[PDB]
Amino acid sequence: GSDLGKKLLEAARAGQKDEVKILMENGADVNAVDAAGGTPLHEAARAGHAKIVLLLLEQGADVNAVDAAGGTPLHEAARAGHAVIVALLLMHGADVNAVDAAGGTPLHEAARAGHEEIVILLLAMGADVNAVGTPLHKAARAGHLEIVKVLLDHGADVNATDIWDATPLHLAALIGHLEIVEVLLKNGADVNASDITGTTPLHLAATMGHLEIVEVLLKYGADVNAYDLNGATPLHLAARMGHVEIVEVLLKYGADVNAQDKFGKTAFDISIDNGNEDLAEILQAAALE
Amino acid sequence: GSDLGKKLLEAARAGQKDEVKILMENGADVNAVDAAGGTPLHEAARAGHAKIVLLLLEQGADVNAVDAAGGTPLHEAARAGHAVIVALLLMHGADVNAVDAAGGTPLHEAARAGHEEIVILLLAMGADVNAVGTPLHKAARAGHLEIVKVLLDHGADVNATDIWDATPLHLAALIGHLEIVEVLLKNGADVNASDITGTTPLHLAATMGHLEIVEVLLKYGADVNAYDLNGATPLHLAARMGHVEIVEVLLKYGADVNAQDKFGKTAFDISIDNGNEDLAEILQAAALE
Amino acid sequence: PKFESKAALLAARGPEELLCFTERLEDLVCFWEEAASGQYSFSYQLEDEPWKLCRLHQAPTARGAVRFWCSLPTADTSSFVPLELRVTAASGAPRYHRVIHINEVVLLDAPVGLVARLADESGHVVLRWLPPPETPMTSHIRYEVDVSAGQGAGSVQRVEILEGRTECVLSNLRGRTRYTFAVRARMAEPSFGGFWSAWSEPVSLLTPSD
Amino acid sequence: PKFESKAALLAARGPEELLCFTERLEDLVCFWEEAASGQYSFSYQLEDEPWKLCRLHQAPTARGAVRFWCSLPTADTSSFVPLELRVTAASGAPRYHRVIHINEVVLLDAPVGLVARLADESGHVVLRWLPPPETPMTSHIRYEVDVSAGQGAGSVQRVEILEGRTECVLSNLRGRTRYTFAVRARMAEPSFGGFWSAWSEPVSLLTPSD
């Protein structure tokens, strides 16, 4: 904007509370923009300087100004974890479900970054719990346990699917987040939901070697002998990865030892192919039964 | 209220997030009251449990419920420094200028306790900067520098007087908070304001032995030879307390050595009465001029 | 009683000043002493409550010095907060006006139960003691150990003990020497301020032969 | 090149697994090796951005083992965030699906510039070295020192060095003995995870006579 305007962009960024007041008193344009179409409000929300955020909003700063990437100060404050500023912005009418070029809402960014309080504050002001680019996918992936708890309490879709056919339980299973898998299951997550590849949560748990998770899934009624597009059961995947304990847990719950995949290979075949002594001994015993 | 109601007062206090949800799902009365007429909302605001505060307000908890002492959850959250909860309450319409039996507003408590962000949040939602039992008196007394800065920026009365005729500058001077005295002076605090006892800020500074403050006051035009109800000048008070350096600073700025109080005593008289060698030497020299 | 000891310690620090202190964090006495002329009013304000008064007691002392003091109630002894005090004459002239913190004027009793023991090696001594009886916040009390020797040696060592620790290890001592030990107490920063307690009961030891 | 060394170290740790690692925090290669049957699709999603693809490179190795690998751009190498990876066959069957963190798979180069020096007293040795060249976060790198002696003594000491410290003091050593020293590097927790680097260039010293 004015020459004082970019001096103000200088000062806002720097968190220089004295200098900000000086430049504004000199008639600086509060909605001056930088190269990125960022406003001093964007910069002050990013650095988390309360008093600058006060002085800007009191002088009519645009609460929902967008930079070239579609980002509002509410997006940046939610991303940077400045709870107070998020509050100040929200009180002044910041758009809870404005979306960046990427389809991201503040709730998206807050959930991904693991800012508990901001997620609470957003939800209380009516953030869409099941908007595009699902927060539950990110929270599940990242292992933000409490956030996943808050998400579910606020009515988030437990079995929402991304572009792959993956549900939050798929991601939780894969990453070995046991409690999250617990919370998900008790809220009615589908234990035998399949992505397009024919993978169930149990498949992921067996493959990654997450023993207890495999047990929790099994207790809630996961299919021990479900097959993917390879015609591979959890026992096939467990075998390939040499997971002895998991093979035993699979056996406990009624696994088919002589299930053949689309190569015609059994788990025992796999064990010989890998020269896995331990697996071959236990699988050999199971095959004769 | 109900039997589950006090179980809920039990659980809210304890911060037991699981148990709170359990008791409410069983039909607990959200506005049950204890012996003190405190609600679970009071208790949850006190302990700062975000999710309990969420679940209560979502189930119609009375945002401005008063206990027997006139205290709203906003008062307790401001006093205990739970910023988020203060935000949640404010968004749900908590009364910014509700007053306890003692005439205290949330802004009163937040300023006294030194909760910067809460003071900001209260002020943004329109807290009365100059309400009864002045926040500036407490902030000045306590030495909350930044809070005093925020108070003054938001238009607080620099020369508000309590029941004694004391202004914030009186309190700042007395406690030896140099910067605060600076900030106050630049915003137009009266350097020669008098309480009912005839005391100016300079009197307080001289008596407590705050040398630099005495200097700052003097630069801004404080009366070096102002008298209280004893007819005592700063030099009298400095003498009684044996403050050598302050006597010298007083001398620099034109102090009357032979001013007599209502006892007829000069500063030099005082020095002999206390057997103060140092003072008597310098005052003796000053008396002969 | 034990009160008189502490009042004398303070008076020497600041004559004709308004000295307030707390013994056990659960009370407060403010006092001053002055010459020839209760003819005074003691008022106080505590943190967001209206201005109240306190019954002044007048008693004599020293060379013509009258001592006025006020004992605040246990009701108004909550800590960590500005407590505004004013002493105003009958005539309505000001006399004193302070702002103090309750927690910042702690003068504890002396430590007790000194136990001095020789180490397994010559030159080392183990000292143990007890916090001031019936005091809270034993964790925030710091001590100082004084090591004297007789025969005009005077004070040879002055050792600060960490907060809450009622144990002291001394080294660097001369063998075959009768040393005398005392400890005093004080409240550790920055949560609390104040003065050193009076010095404890002494115990002595004769170090072994080296 | 130096890449081959690290790929071999990992393959021994997890055969037929999808191994991803970072050399200098500014790139990333994921790779796996398999037998007889790019016929594979490498896709990845990074923190709130849509699913992208990566050009797979196919090259042979070992006993009939084909190694597929993908080098992600420097654009998508920001750390501390979940990075979702999927390897899917031509046929559309799943093959791998992991979630890793960029920061949690650091395999640094070996430390360099070993300098071993005798202490002023027998039995003590001072070792110094340099962080892996052209690496950031030198402050978060921890090292381990191996002390070997010849003649079937093998590894006698294994000493962990604190984060950022490129200095080691050894004691408890036999005098008149030719000892051999090496150091490896690793990223300290909990900000970073990974494996130990390959072992550094050795230097030897002959301890004095005791």
For B277, the 3-state DSSP assignment is: helix
Buried b (16+ CB within 10 A) or exposed e, A47-79: bbbbbbbbbbbeeebebebbbeeebbbbbbbbb
Residues with Cβ within 8 Å of B267's Cβ and at least 6 positions away in sequence, in order, are B233, B235, B236, B238, B239, B247, B257, B259, B279, B283
Q: How many helices (H) and strands (E) in chain D?
A: 1, 15
Give the chain C residue whose CA is nearest to the CA of B170: C97
Question: Token digits for B34?
Answer: 């204890």
Buried b (16+ CB within 10 A) or exposed e, B40-74: bbbbbbbbbbbbbbbbbbeeebebebbbeeebbbb
CB-CB neighbours of C201 under 10 Å: 13
Backbone angles phi, psi at B86, to 5 degrees: -60, -40
Buried b (16+ CB within 10 A) or exposed e, A102-138: eebbbbbbbbbbbbbbbbbbbbbbebebebebbbbbb
Distance CA A70, CA B218 (A): 55
Nearest to D48 among A102, A163, A199 (CB): A102
Chain A residue numbers with beta carbons less than 8 Å from the beta carbon of D98 are 174, 208
CA distances from D98 to A142, A183, B256, D44 (A): 12, 21, 85, 10
Distance CA A150, CA B120 (A): 27
Nearest to B54 among A54, A90, A120 (CB): A120
Going by their DSSP bridges, the two strands C94-101 and C82-89 should be labelled as: antiparallel
Distance CA D88, CA D51 (A): 13
| 8 Å CB contact between D98 and D152 | no
Q: Do chains B and C touch (3 or more CB pairs under 8 A)?
A: yes
Distance CA D58, CA C171 (A): 72
Best of B88, B115, B119 to substitute, by most chain A Cβ atoms within 10 angstroms, is B88
Q: Give the burial class of D38: count Cβ atoms within 10 A of its Cβ; 0-12 exposed, 13-18 middle, 19 or more buried.
A: middle
Which amino acid belongs to residue A3?
A: D
Backbone angles phi, psi at B232, to 5 degrees: -95, 130
Nearest to B117 among A21, A50, A116 (CB): A50
| Angle between helices A145-153 and A178-186 in degrees, nearest 10 | 10
Question: Token digits for C12?
Answer: 């020497």
Nearest to C182 by CA among C152, C159, C150: C159
| 8 Å CB contact between B184 and B168 | yes
DSSP codes, A19-71? HHHHHHHTT--TT---TT---HHHHHHHHT-HHHHHHHHTTT--TT---TTS-
CA B70 to chain centroid: 21
Distance CA C89, CA B230 (A): 10
Q: Do chains A and D touch (3 or more CB pairs under 8 A)?
A: yes
| 8 Å CB contact between A256 and A238 | no
CA A164 to chain centroid: 15
Residues with Cβ within 8 Å of A275's Cβ and at least 6 positions away in sequence, in order, are none
Q: Cα distance from B102 to chain C (closest Cα, Å)?
A: 7
C158 bridge partner residues: C146
| Angle between helices A73-80 and A40-47 in degrees, nearest 10 | 10
Residue corresponding to tokens 């309590």: B162
For D102, the 3-state DSSP assignment is: helix
D205 bridge partner residues: D179
Cα-atom radius of gyration of chain D, to the nearest Å? 21
Going by their DSSP bridges, the two strands D94-101 and D112-118 should be labelled as: unpaired
Distance CA A22, CA A4 (A): 10
Nearest to B150 among A51, A116, A117 (CB): A51
Nearest to B198 by CA among C39, C98, C94, C86: C94
Distance CA A78, CA A108 (A): 9
Helix-strand-coil split of chain B, %, nearest 5: 55, 0, 45
CB contact under 8 Å between B112 and C48, yes or no, is: yes
What's the angle, vertex CA D48, arms to CA D43 and CA D53, rounded to 5? 15
Best of D16, D88, D97 to substitute, by most chain A Cβ atoms within 10 angstroms, is D97
Distance CA C128, CA C73 (A): 35
| 8 Å CB contact between A218 and A224 | yes
Across the B:C interface, residue pairs with CB atoms under 8 Å apart total 53
Chain C window 51-110: which residues touch B at a Cβ cutoff of 8 Å? 51, 81-82, 84, 86, 88, 91-94, 97-99
Q: Cα distance from B74 to chain C (closest Cα, Å)?
A: 16
| 8 Å CB contact between D52 and D84 | no
Chain A residue numbers with beta carbons less than 8 Å from the beta carbon of D15 are 274
Helix (H) or strand (E) holding D87: strand D82-89
Going by their DSSP bridges, the two strands C65-71 and C57-61 should be labelled as: antiparallel
CA distances from B153 to A11, A54, B142, B247 (A): 18, 10, 18, 35
| 8 Å CB contact between B272 and B280 | yes
Give the chain B residue whose CA is nearest to the CA of A151: B51
| 8 Å CB contact between D108 and D187 | yes
Best of A85, A91, A150 to substitute, by most chain B Cβ atoms within 10 angstroms, is A91
Which amino acid belongs to residue C20?
A: C
Distance CA D72, CA A118 (A): 32
CB contact under 8 Å between A84 and B54, yes or no, is: no
- Report domain extents, chain D: 16-105, 106-209
Question: Token digits for C204?
Answer: 């002595």
| 8 Å CB contact between A67 and A90 | no
Count of CA atoms in the C-beta half-sphere (13 A) of D54: 26
| 8 Å CB contact between C122 and C209 | yes
| 8 Å CB contact between B93 and B122 | no
**Beta strands, E only, chain B:** none
Nearest to A247 by CA among A207, A274, A275: A207
Domains D16-105 and D106-209 share a fold: yes
CB contact under 8 Å between C48 and B230, yes or no, is: no
Distance CA A138, CA B118 (A): 31
What's the angle, vertex CA B284, arms to CA B282 and CA B285, rounded to 5? 65
Going by their DSSP bridges, the two strands D154-161 and D82-89 should be labelled as: unpaired
DSSP codes, B24-41? HHTT--TT---TT---HH
Residues with Cβ within 8 Å of B61's Cβ and at least 6 positions away in sequence, in order, are B30, B31, B39, B40, B41
Each as own residue / partner, the long-range contacts of residues A80-83 (CB below 8 Å, 24 or more positions apart, any chain) are A80/A45, A80/A46, A80/A47, A80/A48, A81/A113, A81/A115, A81/A118, A82/A45, A82/A48, A83/A115, A83/A117, A83/A118, A83/A121, A83/B83, A83/B84, A83/B87
Name the H helices within chain A.
3-14, 17-25, 40-47, 50-57, 73-80, 83-91, 106-113, 116-124, 135-142, 145-153, 168-175, 178-186, 201-208, 211-219, 234-240, 244-252, 267-274, 277-288
The CATH code for residues C16-105 is 2.60.40.10
CB contact under 8 Å between A50 and B116, yes or no, is: yes
| 8 Å CB contact between D148 and D157 | no
Distance CA A235, CA A220 (A): 18
For D133: left if phi > 0, alpha if psi spans -120 to 50, otherwise beta; the answer is beta
Q: From edge to edge, which strands make up the β-sheet containing D40-46?
A: D52-54, D40-46, D82-89, D94-101
DSSP codes, A203-222? HHHHHHT-HHHHHHHHHTT-
Interface check for A153 against chain B (CB to CB < 8 A): the answer is: yes
Nearest to D6 by CA among D17, D27, D20: D20
Give the chain A residue whose CA is nearest to the CA of D87: A197
| 8 Å CB contact between C38 and C95 | no
Q: From edge to edge, which strands make up the β-sheet containing C203-206?
A: C154-161, C141-149, C178-187, C203-206
Count of CA atoms in the C-beta half-sphere (13 A) of D100: 24
CA distances from A34 to A8, A42, A60, B165, C193 (A): 10, 10, 18, 51, 51
Chain D residue numbers with beta carbons less than 8 Å from the beta carbon of A141 are 82, 84, 99
Q: From edge to edge, which strands make up the β-sheet containing C52-54?
A: C52-54, C40-46, C82-89, C94-101
Question: Token digits for B265?
Answer: 């005593």
DSSP codes, C6-24? HHHHHHHHSTTS-EEEBSS
Distance CA C145, CA C172 (A): 14
For B215, the 3-state DSSP assignment is: helix
Q: Do chains D and C touch (3 or more CB pairs under 8 A)?
A: no
CA distances from B133 to B70, B160, C80, D137 (A): 15, 10, 20, 53
Chain A residue numbers with beta carbons less than 8 Å from the beta carbon of B116 are 50
What's the angle, vertex CA D101, arms to CA D104 and CA A211, rounded to 5? 85
Buried b (16+ CB within 10 A) or exposed e, D91-102: eebbbebbbbeb
Chain B residue numbers with beta carbons less than 8 Å from the beta carbon of C97 are 174, 199, 204
The CATH fold assigned to D106-209 is Immunoglobulin-like (2.60.40)
| 8 Å CB contact between D46 and D83 | yes
| 8 Å CB contact between C193 and C204 | no
Distance CA C133, CA C188 (A): 17
Which amino acid belongs to residue C87?
A: V
Which amino acid belongs to residue A23?
A: L
Resolution to 1 decimal place, in Å: 5.1
